[PDB]
């Protein structure tokens, strides 16, 4: 399956952004959604996602609180709401499925997930 | 004049099965029940039964059958029996202390297991109380582990209910996939639908 | 309770013939499948042979198949496993297994209900 992830450019720091990630159909209602981001010379780490019912979103240490993720009303379209956006947030950002539901979202890594968006790049300063 | 062969095909066959916590009942009827195929075959490792002889049934009549399958891993399968305890029977799947009836398992690292790993087979982890006997729970909401509400968000004490198992095939049998089918006879005041074929 | 009691082990040579028995008590024999599992004192249990209630249906391990026989008396609730062409790592201590009122055949460890003690066979 192809995901579409669009949004990013320059802001800011205290800044807002809203990147993007849509997969046609049932999809998103199937799959667990994870974000990443990637730093110039750095490991591809996790940031934010929600659990294919829509009722439950997870965020790494570094984000919780600042960062938010919701659906549309379809199910087909993911957002990941960037607010309060520090230097140390600048990376590629990545969306992605996994087909392996771990009960604890805190044993996730990239090696789970697959069906990798285009990364999308977020600056800001 | 009872309409046709049971659909034991259908079930037995199907090319993919249910996850445990959202285990399929197919309600069987109206039709003619071949046994013998089941029991004659060399293919199920485990045909446990209680209180049923499977001989008998080609001669005998209910009003209903009902056949409950799904996919545990090899270690579980002794979960699906009366008066078990365990993540499958506590959370997942419930045979009554008075059960009667057959439970038929068999190795399905074949067809359920790929190179990489299968995770499509989820079982719950987390619960507040025991299933009752026969009981399906579906839910997904967030499992709050503690006295402060999760509000959607997984955290401390509050975690996701359900877990993938990693099906690869150069895993251990006990950590191999299990196709399961419970075998339920049902005898009520009304009109025998499933009869075996010598009547 | 469930007695499994295992006997014709004991000392061979490569090309001899043995022959275990497992005599049964209380299992239900007769809606019993019947099982022969061997651990060599560095592996693990490893089931080289099963046979269903009637004694029609028989599952052996890729390593004994076509040297192992399993065999049932239902009236004398005895299971046998018939073992030529013995070579060197067969030796281990075999283990007769119950599965009670399963009319499938079984081969894995945990679908087995009750054990023998063992008994060594050392060729
Ligand atoms: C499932 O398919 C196999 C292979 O064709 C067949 O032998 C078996 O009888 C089928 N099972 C049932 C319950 O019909």
Known sequence: VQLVESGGGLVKTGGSLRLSCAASGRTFSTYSMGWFRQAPG????????????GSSTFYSDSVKGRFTVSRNNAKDTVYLHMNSLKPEDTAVYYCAITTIVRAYYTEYTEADFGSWGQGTQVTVS | NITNLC??????????????????RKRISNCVADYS?????????????????????????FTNVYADSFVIRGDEVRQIAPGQTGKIADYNYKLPDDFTGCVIAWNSNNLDSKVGGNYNYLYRLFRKSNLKPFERDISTEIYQAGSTPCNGVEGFN????????????????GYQPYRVVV?????????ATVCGPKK | QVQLVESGGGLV??????????????????????????????????????????????????????????????????????????????????????????????????????????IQVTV
């Open chain 3, 13 to 118: 040579q490569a090309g001899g013939s043995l022959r275990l028995s497992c005599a049964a008590s209380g299992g239900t024999f007769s809606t019993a499948a019947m099982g022969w599992f061997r651990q060599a004192p560095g592996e693990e249990r490893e089931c080289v042979a099963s046979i269903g209630w009637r004694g029609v249906r028989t599952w052996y391990a890729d390593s004994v198949k076509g040297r192992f026989t399993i065999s049932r008396d239902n009236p004398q609730n005895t299971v046998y496993l018939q073992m030529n062409n013995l070579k060197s790592g067969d030796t281990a201590v075999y283990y007769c297994a119950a599965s009670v009122g399963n009319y499938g055949l079984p081969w894995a460890h945990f679908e087995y209900d009750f054990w023998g003690q063992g």
């Open chain 2, 183 to 191: 075998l339920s006879f049902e005898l009520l005041h009304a009109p």
């Open chain 1, 42 to 53: 750095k490991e591809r780490e996790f940031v934010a996602g929600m659990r294919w019912t």
């Open chain 2, 158 to 173: 509050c975690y996701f209910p359900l877990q993938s198992y990693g099906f690869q095939p150069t895993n251990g049998v």
């Open chain 2, 7 to 24: 659909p034991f095909g259908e079930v037995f066959n199907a090319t993919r099965f249910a996850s445990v916590y959202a285990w399929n």
């Open chain 2, 37 to 61: 195929v089941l029991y004659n075959s060399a293919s199920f490792s485990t045909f446990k039964c209680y209180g049923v002889s499977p001989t008998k049934l080609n001669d005998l009549c």
